[PDB]
Paper text:
The P84R mutation is interesting from a structural perspective. Firstly, Pro84 occurs at the beginning of an α-helix that is bent by almost 90° relative to a neighboring α-helix in the structure. The R27L crystal structure lacks two neighbors; the A75I and A79S mutant have no net differences, while the P84R mutant adds three possible interactions.
In the case of the glutaredoxin that is the focus of this study, glutaredoxin A from the cyanobacterium Synechocystis sp. PCC 6803 serves as the preferred electron donor for the 2-electron reduction of arsenate to arsenite, catalyzed by arsenate reductase. As part of the thioredoxin superfamily, glutaredoxin A shares the characteristic thioredoxin fold. Our random mutagenesis approach has yielded four new crystal structures of glutaredoxin A, one for each of the following variants: R27L, A75I, A79S, and P84R.
Numbering used by the authors: -10 to 88
The structure:
């Protein structure tokens, strides 16, 4: 396989699992999406507009919270828009993303 390949016992390649539950038109969700997009990271958005079943699935993972958005990185609950911005302002978010 021609190319410039990195080796460090990675095995099968996998990357940060980044998830965000949103309503598309929530201004807090929009602000959080903008931050993740500006980082350039690959991520999954669960847009749950009008979907109560999905909100209950979200609350089950997010400490019972139904507020939006809810963000997870590598299966760890990070919190909402304020939480991710606070992490970035503290110089801690890139390391979680990771780098």
């Amino acid at each position: 396989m021609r190319g410039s390949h990195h080796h460090h016992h990675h095995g099968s390649a996998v990357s940060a699992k980044i998830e965000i539950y949103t309503w598309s038109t929530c201004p807090f969700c929009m602000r959080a999406l903008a931050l993740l997009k500006r980082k350039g990271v690959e991520f999954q958005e669960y847009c749950i507009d009008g979907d109560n079943e999905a909100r209950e699935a979200m609350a089950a993972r997010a400490n019972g919270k139904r507020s939006l958005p809810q963000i997870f990185i590598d299966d760890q609950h990070i919190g909402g828009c304020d939480d991710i911005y606070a992490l970035d302002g503290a110089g801690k978010l890139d390391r979680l993303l990771h780098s």
